[PDB]
Nucleic acid binder design. Structure first.
Length: 315
RNA sequence: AGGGACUAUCGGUUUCAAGCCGAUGGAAUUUGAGGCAAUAACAGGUCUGUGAUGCCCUUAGACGUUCUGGGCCGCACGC
């Protein structure tokens, strides 16, 4: 039934959209990512023209943003980039509470646990490093031999003990899940055929996805740690997306979005629309995606310089 | 003190080699510019820079030295 219809975008950046972020406490309060050294804050007013007011740039690094994770409260935006950081931005404002420095090779990430505290970040030095909500390390993990690509938060409804769990990534072709308090050892994902360039997580504590340079999307549990639904999607995803509470997958496969539908096992609905003056090898192929925090609004993002948000509505 | 630019990023253009346009970012035609500048030389110039210097000449009516005065600034004109 669900005819998914393709609508007004929100265009704005000069470089190349490379993440994007579900606001995670004020789902308007969009908050978007970059390549050309900012973060254009887009409202969703919504009211039609502009779908819905590009109200704070935020400028820079010196170099290219690969991320922009919102807090558990959702008004404090956490940077990264190719000049070896963080720089915690204020969503409201233009400012740098705490330069977090220290890496060597080019952050690839950023994420924040359910209370806004013991943050993490991958790298190319081939680690990891915790930097609390101060430029300071708990510790500097080293179990991987590689470019560890991405790490995620998971959002726990066994109501949290308190010695918790997070995750990771990927040229050694593996994952590894680090107690976020005292980085202990828990399981990994063996097998794959090249680069793990992403992963994702459950919106309670028992779901995950990884993904593709091979084609296959190798799925989860964390609270079963057993390898799952093994799909086959040709090119790659660069750019994965849970609906929050539907059971819909969203990931941007080059080519679709393949909604795969992680219950039964079907292709509902592929969005490759809209398109004007190209030689293929121009599509202006994505690099970040999200599901309205409250879970409709897919904020579909693309290279080019035009975000193209595309919600699901009625038959 | 240091860092920082590599024609970089797609797009073309080609033996899809070495290369070459264009547009973006950029502070930024080999980044601009000089300076060092093999191989072999020329009988180019210079002993009128030398207490660097061969061989001739000069050696006190010296062509060595020095006080004066003018001389290289003299014009129908050629470059």
């Amino acid at each position: 039934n669900e005819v998914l219809v393709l609508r007004g975008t929100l265009e704005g950046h000069n470089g190349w959209v490379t993440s994007l972020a579900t606001s995670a406490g004020q789902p308007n309060l969009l908050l978007s990512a970059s390549r050309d050294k900012t973060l254009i804050s887009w409202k969703l007013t919504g009211d039609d023209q502009k779908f819905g007011v590009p109200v704070r740039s935020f400028k820079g690094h010196s170099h290219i943003v690969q991320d922009c994770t919102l807090t558990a409260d959702g008004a404090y935006a956490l940077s990264a980039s190719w000049d070896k950081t963080l720089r915690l931005w204020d969503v409201a404002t233009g400012e740098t509470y705490q330069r977090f420095v220290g890496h060597k090779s080019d952050v690839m990430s950023v994420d924040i646990d359910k209370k806004a505290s013991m943050i993490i970040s991958g790298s190319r030095d081939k680690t990891i490093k915790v930097w609390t909500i101060k430029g300071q390390c708990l510790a500097t993990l080293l179990g991987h031999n590689d470019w560890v690509s991405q790490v995620r938060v998971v959002p726990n409804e066994k109501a949290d003990d308190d010695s918790v769990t997070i995750i990771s990534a990927g040229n050694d072709k593996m994952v590894k899940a680090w107690n976020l308090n005292q980085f202990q050892i828990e399981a990994d994902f063996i097998g794959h055929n090249s680069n793990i360039n992403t992963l994702t997580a459950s919106p309670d504590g028992t779901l995950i996805a990884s993904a593709g340079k091979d084609g296959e999307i190798m799925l989860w549990n964390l609270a079963a740690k057993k390898a799952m639904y093994t799909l086959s999607a040709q090119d790659e995803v660069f750019s994965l997306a849970f609906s929050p509470n539907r059971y819909w997958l969203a990931a941007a496969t080059a080519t679709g979005i393949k909604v795969f539908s992680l219950d039964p096992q079907y292709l509902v609905d592929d969005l490759r629309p809209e398109f004007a003056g190209y030689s293929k090898a121009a599509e202006p192929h994505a690099v970040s995606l999200a599901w309205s925090a409250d879970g409709q609004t897919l904020f579909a993002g693309y290279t080019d310089n035009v975000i193209r948000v595309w919600q699901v509505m009625t038959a």
